[PDB]
Swiss-Prot record, chains A, B:
UniProt keyword annotations, A-Z: Cytoplasm, Hydrolase, Isopeptide bond, Magnesium, Metal-binding, Phosphoprotein, Ubl conjugation
Residues reported in the UniProt entry to bind Mg(2+) 1: D115, D120, D152
Species for this entry: Saccharomyces cerevisiae (strain ATCC 204508 / S288c) (Baker's yeast)
Protein name, entry field: Inorganic pyrophosphatase
A GO biological-process term: phosphate-containing compound metabolic process
Length: 282, 282
């Protein structure tokens, strides 16, 4: 059973969320199995950012057991700006554990190196998720995002517990039940960093959303990349903390890393500067 | 100075928000002057619903001093559903005090009776407002929405304190600085009640947003209607509580109404059913 351990108050630099397995903290990056049900294509997704929020929370790569923390820019907490007609993230945003977008090789289909983090997942279900949540989803498609010139695949997924899950099995179903979502998704990842001063991003295949099978192929590739990484065989792991507590055959295995995690110190959400309210029309 | 006195916790049946003048409760409907600056046509807007929220809160016509209260639906609190690509309300939503959409007579431009309540206001500023807030705004334009067959004008306004206030003076400036907003606004009021089983709404003038001058005329008309209502000279006030504490010349004037209001009893917001999370595609 997966639960969460929160340190500090949300919206602060001290905020941390570790994922626990039977009350024992594990690495949110390496210790959670990619597959919930491999042959049925059911995955374990780690939710980082709930739909309609702004705080750029993520599984941090350079901290032991890889707790979810808030990203920063120039020493300041990072909040993704509101871009009309969107409000924060338009999907439950997160990642697939045991995956890695290899930065050391130029990916052929995109002609760019990976963005050095687990593959990204867009969960389109009706219910709003919570940070640290490990839910089971089924992949329906994938879009090749080139984020600031880097391979940044976005998987289109749906919680298996969603009332609409049995009716979704491939990408075309998405447009069927969620008309306009894929187009909005394209636009979002194209312009979300413009209010930051960054250039507009671009998509490969003209932003086309590839089907479920294509999605599985990419997911499995990034899984193998992580297999190489965790095995300690990458040419450059970039200082990523490979500490884990469930993989005894790997060189960075350390059961003790779990007990070293302080106890929960959950505090109420800290306030967010009023400027994040701003809706940008860009 | 205007402040708010909160009763109970937000998102509960006991929730109530009264507006105070120098510490004493006044009628949110009749005691708040319509004009902040009449020479400059700066209006006082009573905010009911903050942008991106779902709780259907509004100035209560049948309660003394007209505290803002959430509408109910079959014994439960009533929320407006999320209609893709929108999240709850897309504007700081409220009304202009001392105005009334006359239900006893048909409005010429729309050929329908008014919806029996203060003229509505959509504040397009960046900062998200709060319930019970009285803010000074400039009128930019107006839209003639027919809500369920009733005259339901929507004034487009901006907080004078908004960074963009100086640059917005007439309707055309809304499209110039908030491109897409007017079209999104048209669509929003047209479909927002569809998930509730209601027919799609319609707009007069093909949804055209009339300019400031036009808007000023309509507002003036609704203000004249409230003067007839507050003076008790309407043919039918529809059981509206006309109790006020600042209009000594009206038959329902009663200063003691202010002292009858219980003291604030603020409590933390109550959780909202997860089903309001749902994003409808209509
Ligand atoms: Mn980044
Ligand atoms: Mn990521
Ligand atoms: Mn990215
Ligand atoms: Mn990424
Ligand atoms: Mn109403
Ligand atoms: Mn109203
Ligand atoms: Mn209405
Ligand atoms: Mn109305």
């Amino acid at each position: 059973t997966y639960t969460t351990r929160q340190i500090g108050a949300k919206n602060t630099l001290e905020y941390k969320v570790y994922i626990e397995k039977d009350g024992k903290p594990v690495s949110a990056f390496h210790d959670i199995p990619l597959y919930a049900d491999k042959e049925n294509n059911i995955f374990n997704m780690v939710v980082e950012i709930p739909r309609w929020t702004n705080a750029k929370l993520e599984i941090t790569k350079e901290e032991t057991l890889n707790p979810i923390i808030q990203d920063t820019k120039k020493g300041k907490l990072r909040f993704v700006r509101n871009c009309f007609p969107h409000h924060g993230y338009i999907h439950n945003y997160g990642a697939f554990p045991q995956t890695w977008e290899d930065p050391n090789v130029s990916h052929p289909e995109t002609k760019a190196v990976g963005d050095n983090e687990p593959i990204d997942v867009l969960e389109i279900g009706e219910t709003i998720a919570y940070t640290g949540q490990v839910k089971q989803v089924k992949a329906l498609g994938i879009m090749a995002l080139l984020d600031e010139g880097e391979t940044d695949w976005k998987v289109i997924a749906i919680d298996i517990n969603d009332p609409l899950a049995p009716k979704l099995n491939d990408i075309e179903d998405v447009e069927k039940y969620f008309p306009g979502l894929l187009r909005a998704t394209n636009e979002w990842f194209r312009i979300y960093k413009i209010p930051d001063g960054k250039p507009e991003n671009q998509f490969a295949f003209s932003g086309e959303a590839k089907n479920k099978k294509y999605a599985l192929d990419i997911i499995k590739e990034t899984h193998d990349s992580w297999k190489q990484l965790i095995a300690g065989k990458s040419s450059d792991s970039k200082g990523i903390d490979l500490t884990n507590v469930t993989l005894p055959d790997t060189p960075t295995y350390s059961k003790a890393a779990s007990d070293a995690i302080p106890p929960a110190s959950l505090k109420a959400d800290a306030p967010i500067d009023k400027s994040i309210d701003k809706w940008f029309f860009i």
